[PDB]
Structures are given as structure tokens and as C-alpha cells.
From Swiss-Prot:
Entry function: Plays a role in pre-mRNA splicing and in the regulation of alternative splicing events. Activates exon skipping of its own pre-mRNA during muscle cell differentiation. Binds to the polypyrimidine tract of introns. May promote RNA looping when bound to two separate polypyrimidine tracts in the same pre-mRNA. May promote the binding of U2 snRNP to pre-mRNA. Cooperates with RAVER1 to modulate switching between mutually exclusive exons during maturation of the TPM1 pre-mRNA. Represses the splicing of MAPT/Tau exon 10.
Annotated protein name in UniProt: Polypyrimidine tract-binding protein 1
Residue(s) carrying Phosphotyrosine: Y79
The species this protein was found in: Homo sapiens (Human)
Linked residues for Glycyl lysine isopeptide (Lys-Gly) (interchain with G-Cter in SUMO2): K17
Highest taxon of source: Eukaryota
Phosphoserine modified-residue sites: S93
Gene, per the UniProt record: PTBP1
Modified residues (Phosphothreonine): T90
Binding partners and assembly: Monomer. Part of a ternary complex containing KHSRP, PTBP1, PTBP2 and HNRPH1. Interacts with RAVER1 and SFPQ. Interacts with IVNS1ABP (via BACK domain); the interaction is direct.
Localization annotation: Nucleus
Domain RRM as annotated: residue spans: 11-95
Length: 98
RNA sequence: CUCUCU
């Protein structure tokens, strides 16, 4: 289906193409001016990420900002959309408890 | 490098 693209979405955005060894400190310092960012995630083995945010309007402005700014991945555009999900969580595996 | 799957 077509459900990859948003139309009335929520607070997690997703990023592709990511740098060779980019860090959370950079990604959150790029989401901080917008609301608070509640979180991020790193699909780092595919060079992809999520960026989850504390307010729907912050993230609407954050994605529209990234549709405006493009912050340039050292010599190419940066590839953003709202997520296939709502509300990111990042807790540890069942093994750690055991 | 389009979604937390390999």
C-alpha cells in the first residue's frame, strides 16, 4: 500500500542516507530548537534514524524546517519524512532483566 | 540506505 507517506501524522520523523558515524548529540542538537525532542533512534547498520518529538506542532515545524533548510549531509541533501508509526520507545531487551 | 526485521 501507499501508507509510508504521512497525511495526518504524529511526533516521530524518519531520516535516510545518514553519515558514516553520526551521533545522537548532533541529531538531538538539530531537533532541540523546535520543541524538546522526546527521543531519537538509529537504524545505524542501514544509515537510517528516527527523531521523536515532545509536541505535534514542534515536529510539524521540525519536518517542514527540514523540507526548507536541507542541512546537507557533507555534500548531498538529507532525506526526511514523518514515520510509519506514532510515539517512539527505546527500552532494553528481555535478556537484561534475566 | 523508506521504519525500531534478518
Amino acid at each position: 500500500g501507499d501508507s509510508r507517506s504521512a497525511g495526518v501524522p504524529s511526533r516521530v520523523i524518519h531520516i535516510r542516507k545518514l553519515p558514516i558515524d553520526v551521533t545522537e548529540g548532533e541529531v538531538i542538537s538539530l531537533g532541540l530548537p523546535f520543541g524538546k525532542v522526546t527521543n531519537l533512534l538509529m537504524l545505524k547498520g542501514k544509515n537510517q534514524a528516527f527523531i521523536e518529538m515532545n509536541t505535534e506542532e514542534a515536529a510539524n515545524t521540525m519536518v517542514n524546517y527540514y523540507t526548507s533548510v536541507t542541512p546537507v549531509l557533507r555534500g548531498q541533501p538529507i532525506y526526511i519524512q514523518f514515520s510509519n508509526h506514532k510515539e517512539l520507545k527505546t527500552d532494553s531487551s528481555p535478556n537484561q532483566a534475566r
